[PDB]
Design a protein around this ligand. Structure first.
Ligand SMILES: CNC(=O)Cn1cc(-c2ccc3c(c2)[C@H](F)C[C@]32NC(=O)N(CC(=O)N(Cc3ccc(F)cc3)[C@@H](C)C(F)(F)F)C2=O)cn1
Length: 319
């Protein structure tokens, strides 16, 4: 069988799928199936500071030229009608203890997606909370202090991970997206997994950030681009432009404090218990979108998403 269960295990993957399956066991719903969480890619990368910011702070020695991180691609599958369905995919960026500031001990949830066929429908949000909250708890135990989430609102026909979304899987508005993550984070705050969370604007204000070299620099994030455009415009201060852009989009950006204050200062180095997992199909989101486009693998209906997950799984086992 080329099932998701037969894909190599990881500490992270089995920690997450245990959290989901314990939850589903307690619910004891007849429509629910066994869930599989697999880390299908893990590789070391670096994000280079862009020219505008490089000239302003890197050439003057005020900021690092590049920040090293580990990128992981984790997928969740559920058994529906005897076959696996991939219903959740996430690409993360992890900036460890050997990363120069302002990026050290930070995790960035770059782009996230899902296919709304999780059965039963009533347990869908709860299962996503187990996955996201479970990931925050996991990295918090390894020594990561902060979590960052850009809830980038999608647009019709724009897929982040899964090619051809169901026509009725609706595109949430920024207000809806902010509300979902607020409810999710409020749940982690009450379970004592998260210390507290704030929007990016409230966060920069209460951290007393005065320079753009203090803002964490993430691969593909909105803020490395805002900074380039702000500098370019100012060539025709940077800090007031940054605070203005943060005020306008604060509802989409979350900063999540996992390890707060005193505990955060006496921390040992971050050591990942799992090995690196090469997989060029999951090296970023474009490889799997490209493959699904060329091979006509759609996730627009339940059976189409089940057939696509099957092809996806034989590609993952073949490497
Ligand atoms: C006319 N038809 C067409 O255009 C068909 N068509 C539809 C799309 C389309 C739809 C959805 C999405 C995308 C494209 C993007 F890839 C990303 C996205 N996928 C995804 O899961 N979200 C998060 C989301 O929706 N959450 C939050 C959430 C969910 C899971 C999770 F683990 C953490 C958070 C909800 C529960 C919310 F209600 F809270 F918002 C996306 O926004 C493209 N085409």
């Amino acid at each position: 069988k080329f099932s998701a269960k037969r894909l190599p295990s990881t500490r992270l993957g089995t920690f997450l799928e245990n959290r989901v399956n314990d939850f589903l066991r307690r619910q004891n719903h007849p429509e629910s199936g066994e869930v599989t969480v697999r880390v299908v890619h893990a590789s070391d990368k670096t994000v280079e500071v862009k020219p505008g910011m490089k000239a302003r702070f890197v050439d003057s020695g005020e900021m690092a030229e590049s920040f090293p991180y580990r990128t992981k691609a984790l997928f969740a599958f559920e058994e529906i009608d005897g076959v696996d369905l991939c219903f959740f995919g996430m690409h993360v960026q992890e900036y460890g203890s050997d990363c120069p500031p302002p990026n050290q001990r930070r995790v960035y949830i770059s782009y996230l997606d899902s296919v709304h066929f999780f059965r039963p429908k009533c347990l869908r949000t709860a299962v996503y909370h187990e996955i996201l909250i479970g990931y925050l708890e996991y990295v918090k135990k390894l020594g990561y202090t902060t979590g960052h989430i850009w809830a980038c609102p999608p647009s019709e026909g724009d897929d982040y991970i899964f090619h051809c979304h169901p026509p009725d899987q609706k595109i949430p508005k920024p207000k809806r997206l902010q509300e979902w993550y607020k409810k999710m984070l409020d749940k982690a705050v009450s379970e004592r997994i998260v210390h507290d969370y704030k929007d990016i604007f409230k966060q920069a204000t209460e951290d007393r950030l005065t320079s753009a070299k203090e803002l964490p620099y993430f691969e593909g994030d909105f803020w490395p681009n805002v900074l380039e455009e702000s500098i370019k415009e100012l060539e025709q201060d940077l800090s007031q432009k940054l605070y203005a852009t943060m005020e306008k989009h604060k509802e989409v950006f979350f900063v999540i404090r996992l390890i707060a204050g005193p505990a955060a200062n006496s921390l040992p180095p971050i050591v990942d218990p799992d090995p690196l997992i090469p997989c060029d199909l999951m090296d970023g989101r474009d490889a799997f979108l490209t493959l699904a486009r060329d091979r006509h693998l759609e996730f627009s209906s339940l059976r189409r998403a089940q057939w696509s997950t099957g092809c996806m799984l034989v590609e993952l086992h073949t490497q």
